[PDB]
Amino acid sequence: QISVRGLAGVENVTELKKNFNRHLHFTLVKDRNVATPRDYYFALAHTVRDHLVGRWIRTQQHYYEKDPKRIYYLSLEFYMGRTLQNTMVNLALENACDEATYQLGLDMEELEEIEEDAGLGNGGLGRLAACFLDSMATLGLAAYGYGIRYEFGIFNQKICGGWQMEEADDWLRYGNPWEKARPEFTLPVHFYGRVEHTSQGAKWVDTQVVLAMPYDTPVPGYRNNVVNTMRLWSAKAPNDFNLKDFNVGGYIQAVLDRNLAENISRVLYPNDNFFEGKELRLKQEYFVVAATLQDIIRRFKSSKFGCRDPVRTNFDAFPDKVAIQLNDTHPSLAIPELMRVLVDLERLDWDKAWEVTVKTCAYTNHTVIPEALERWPVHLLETLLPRHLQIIYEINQRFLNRVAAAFPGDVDRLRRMSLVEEGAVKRINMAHLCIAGSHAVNGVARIHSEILKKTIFKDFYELEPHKFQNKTNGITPRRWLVLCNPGLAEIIAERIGEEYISDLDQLRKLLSYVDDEAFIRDVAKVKQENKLKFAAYLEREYKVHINPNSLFDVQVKRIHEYKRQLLNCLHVITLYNRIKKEPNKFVVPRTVMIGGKAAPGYHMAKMIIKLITAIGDVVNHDPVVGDRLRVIFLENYRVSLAEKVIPAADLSEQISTAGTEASGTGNMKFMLNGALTIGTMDGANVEMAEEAGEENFFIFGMRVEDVDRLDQRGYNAQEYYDRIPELRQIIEQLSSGFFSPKQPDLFKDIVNMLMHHDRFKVFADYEEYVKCQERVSALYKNPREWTRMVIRNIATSGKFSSDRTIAQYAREIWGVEPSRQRLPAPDEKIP
Amino acid sequence: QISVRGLAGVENVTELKKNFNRHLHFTLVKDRNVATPRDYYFALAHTVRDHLVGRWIRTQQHYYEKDPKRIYYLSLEFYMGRTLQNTMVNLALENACDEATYQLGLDMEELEEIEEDAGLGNGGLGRLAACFLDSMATLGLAAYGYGIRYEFGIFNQKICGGWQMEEADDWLRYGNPWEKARPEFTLPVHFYGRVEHTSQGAKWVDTQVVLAMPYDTPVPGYRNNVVNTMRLWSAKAPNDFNLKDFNVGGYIQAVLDRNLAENISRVLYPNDNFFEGKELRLKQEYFVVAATLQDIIRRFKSSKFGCRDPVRTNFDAFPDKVAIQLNDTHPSLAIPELMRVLVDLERLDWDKAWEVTVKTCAYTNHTVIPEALERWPVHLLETLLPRHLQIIYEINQRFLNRVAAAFPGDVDRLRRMSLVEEGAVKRINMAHLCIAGSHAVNGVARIHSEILKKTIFKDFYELEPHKFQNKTNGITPRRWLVLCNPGLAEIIAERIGEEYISDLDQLRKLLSYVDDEAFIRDVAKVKQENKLKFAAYLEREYKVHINPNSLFDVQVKRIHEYKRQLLNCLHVITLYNRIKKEPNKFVVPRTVMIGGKAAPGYHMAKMIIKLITAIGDVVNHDPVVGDRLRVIFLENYRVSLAEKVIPAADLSEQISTAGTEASGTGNMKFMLNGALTIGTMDGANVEMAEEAGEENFFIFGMRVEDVDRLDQRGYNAQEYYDRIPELRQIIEQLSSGFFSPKQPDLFKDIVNMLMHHDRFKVFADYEEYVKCQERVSALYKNPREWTRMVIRNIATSGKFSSDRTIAQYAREIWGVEPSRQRLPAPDEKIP
Ligand SMILES: *Cc1c(COP(=O)(O)O)cnc(C)c1O
Ligand SMILES: *Cc1c(COP(=O)(O)O)cnc(C)c1O
Ligand SMILES: OC[C@H]1O[C@H](O)[C@H](O)[C@@H](O)[C@@H]1O
Ligand SMILES: OC[C@H]1O[C@H](O)[C@H](O)[C@@H](O)[C@@H]1O
Q: Where is this site: Involved in the association of subunits (chains A, B)?
């Protein structure tokens, strides 16, 4: 018994070894004597991909025969991570491949580490899209992920001298065994041009043509023979005009300029919760909307309609056949674009086309911070997409009339609700477009959904209350438990069975073992084993040593002023300062691991990375501290690293100023993997504590009320500085170079900011946070009672499955029903 | 009996059908109901490539075990054409695949047409390299083709309004089933930088790094189980400095600028026999030399030396293990580069390193016209490659001293021989570098080799006569007979057997059937069948009809003033004019097909294409002419088209001014495919007539003597215009717009040129050429005697095999022996 990673059966280990050898010779064109671990990794990736082309082809032909309502998940990000082990888990192949490669004399685990991550996402939003795709295929939905196939994903972070160095992520350098290019299905996307109003229609004329080429990646559900499709577009120059617009320039130059159109899919924008109004971003945005909508209408034009039905292309049933989800406002151009095709090209009247558009679209909002909001300058939309600016002015014109009629005489409302913002440069507010042209708008945790209805989209909720919904986020139990933490899934599965992997509410049944002494030791034992293995990985891939017997205090997520890595930093310096003061007083030892990426242009986030490494230089070399405290910055945090750190954490840091994190999902990953949370009543932390009970959680701080009371009052940090000696001491340590000796003024920007422009009021939660941290160390010191609380969190985390989330989107926004029904085998077949 | 395209055996047609179906499902991820002809083409290309990975792997391990002298053929061009049928011919797979796909219900021939050509060549030089690679693998040589993997090959030509329109050749748009990327083996190439002279060596410091990534394509020999390798390099940005040279620009821009380094392999230069001194061409040139030489020295450092031998890396045996052939001066930077590594990096003294360099390198010259010669400006070499300019000045310094010592006091010689040319801008003459640093220099036909020794490299021949050699070009009997013309190879094979495919001298034995009446009808019958099939292809892919019963008069090659498409044009207008004069007088009917590509910037060549289409507009629409004369411009001439036209020709036009075409190979292709040649005593036409006897050939014109007598005299075209009424009439037809009605002055440049600056003296051969053409029509009118002459040409064409050429390079330049010895099977094997 290795774990329940499937049967390592006799006819099938022999099958896998035969095919491994076919692909090393025939695919890789290598022989055993010059094959490296990477060639071995590829022979395995190809052998495993062979088991899902069967199911893929019959899942796709199936939706064609039966023709269900189809769900299009449009996102500019998909943060997939590595795909070999996930595919093995979902096909029940993991133990047979483990035995087979072991027989070939190889370590599967060594080979798995060779796979480069698909890092086509920034953080939270992109990873929600990967967890969503997994759950839509597990629930049997005829669902399609649609996005851009970026050839450079999020940069790989290097720390040089304590500073982040960004370098290009050439994830495709060696190939991608999982995608299937589909150049047969390329589609044109148009840019610039102008509009001729001619007799029976506006026409978009004189456009530049970029071609969008598909690449399909299979999305397997968990053990049900459904393999859905993630289609990702590549930009390609036409070979005509990008060459045959003639009369001198140069032939070589005309060919070399082809990579002007192909730059559109070259690199992801590295910004998490921050809007950059660059023209290339808008081009990326129109490009995935333009091409996706052609693929969508094509499938509807076949359906059972391009056969018969009423016979007239009656777009009336388009909403009963199509649901498109907008993942944030990044694909909001899908609303004027679907209006353009229907009015200009299919020739429907405005009001029929508008009824159809709003009934098929729906919008997920992901943040309330204002700098994250997309507000595109009109002179940009004007130049680039002139017909869509006209459709946005007419949507706007008609929406505000509906507002006028309902709130008569309320003239500030009208200017407030406008999709057009006057000012310095006029802008189009993409979030207002999405509520006007969607039938459902949702937030991503119950508090955030309430804050949208009460603050940011209040006027919109008073006008159309029925659109506003909530759908709390989730995580997939398959990568985020079964795959990163097989030890924990075994000891759970020993007691309650394996049906919980697709029914996570069943973890409630673990609550009757909260006093079972074998289970308490087992739960404690795997956390000890994970702590040992990450501690080893650390000296392997990156180190100068840690202590597995300390509390592993970890905060890993994007670096942001609202997620508050500086509040954690202030806490760490307190601990150091107190044991410099009382050296021979025992304290619970901690390894505090802080990791994440800062966007290239966010100078404060880049300075926060420099402060964490500077605290670590001092703390990790004090001889009086010894092993009692280490501070480690976790380099190049990404999906595959999160699969390693989150099993080995004891304490989860979820420290954002109440009202700023819309949900968070890092927090959920840590709850089913046996970590306890210290956190504010923010995002989904509220529903997590409500699920485990506030006594099984360490909440501190200001709630949203208190944040607004303080803002009515006026936040003044000098008051905190004046009343708290310990906090006072830290700041003057920063301000004199204790932490930056050669360069004493280095941290003047963090100090100036914290003292004078702290938007997320870090000092207001400092006392309650160090006092809360005093209570978790007290519980760590009582192992039996830490593990019984941990068992309260694991057992109560199944609400937070993305299968719960997807079944509610499916039921209350998409109008389709989940099915955990196994599709009729893979079995062979050629027709 | 289909033809002798191999056995369509029982266990093997079932084998091929099984594998076709495996790849359509598993590789293509398609099912029979949505698979197009292209998906079918790919299932076949993958099934056939599976039969040569076995042989490839054992051919490569073999040279490793036995370790022979290895031949590196360095060329900036490889004009490969399509590779499926060729591979099928060489593996004896053609009939089994024909039966197998027929059983699957498909037409192999329809699928073969779907393959896009690998057009990584311009014409003559690049196609010689593809014919050379075929013959080196058929003769069992441990040989490597080395070049640039261009992603845009030679442009696809469109005629719009009679004008050439150039468009990009995206030959990889759909994939290439034949290459195998080898990113594991990438190598750095350095650019710009500077030289520090430091204590014990010059060092090239501060360089930009481009990475060269290999892609290997298999080269199968004819039926012998040898599969050699064509390695082709791709340019790739490093992800460090092309990003981590820091302090503002932009992160997105730094990633988008990666395609500055990757532009180096983006597009072939479309110039045939013309030098453009562009910096990107030099970068292309240093890049294939830099990376190839690293791969070469690596293999020598293992050999049996990196095991033992004397034990010291004694580069003395480097010439006994390495031979590199330079295909024209385009890889001449291989001589200062191999000196740089040996002196600077391996630290040999100058004179030992120079002895080794000259003993391993050899240079093929391909043309005597001066504008084709590479003469790179010193300020270019200075900037880009500063260490190599220093090595070229020291090679030069020492070479001219050897010249001084041998020709004492001859000071004009010294300036004449110099690798450095003073003048307006100093330049480095790349051809003089190649003779100074090569042990053999050869030309490509016996006259051209003599003209090199007598005119262009006379000083160099007086100094070192032993270097100058001749190696007349050849064509491969496999694509150029067995593959384009299976009908002709069958009727030959019926009489004399199949050993001639690798022993083409055996075609002499056909001479005893010159009076066999069955053979005369058969030879005539396949030419009739080919004429019928190209005439059909014409209305299929491109037309408004031709007559298969006319003489197919075809001139297909690059458009150039020296290859003289205008002399053919003058001839065509004469024929038209004479039958406008005597309408009811019978003449032998002709379809004259002129095709080829003009380089983008060669305005006269582009105007010659416009004149041929304008003659065709008039001639093809005269009702008095009827079918007696049609003029057709053959669009987008390339390798796969040449495989179609050359079997269907009756008359081969090889009309270049004596002394300008160094060899020609189009002429050889036409001699083994049953076409008669009208031609001047130029290039290899001389050795062809000498092989078939001048009575079996239609030679006309000025010989080289006469060209030089006329140049001593002074060529004056007005004299020709004054004495020949028929030629006079044509010119004034051009000069008044008979051929360009709306735009009468359109052809003033061709007339002005012909009259005043004709470098290739088109009018001097006009009388003798129309008079020679009068005699071929007279023989066409006597079918039995045309076919008996045709049989004199086929039977005597085996000198012109590239296997004869390669066995003489091999013996008299490379020092290795051919072997037609079948390598021990494909048979399976895993070690
Ligand atoms: C889940 C995940 C995130 C989201 O974490 P939060 O705490 O919600 O900000 C970001 N990055 C990675 C690699 C993740 O796996
Ligand atoms: C062989 C070949 C050439 C060379 O023809 P020449 O008559 O020697 O100039 C050029 N183009 C193609 C496509 C060829 O096959
Ligand atoms: O919705 C997925 C994630 O999107 C964004 O990253 C939000 O900041 C985060 O709170 C949320 O959980
Ligand atoms: O050597 C191959 C060919 O190279 C060049 O194209 C020459 O012009 C031609 O005469 C020769 O046959």
A: 97, 131
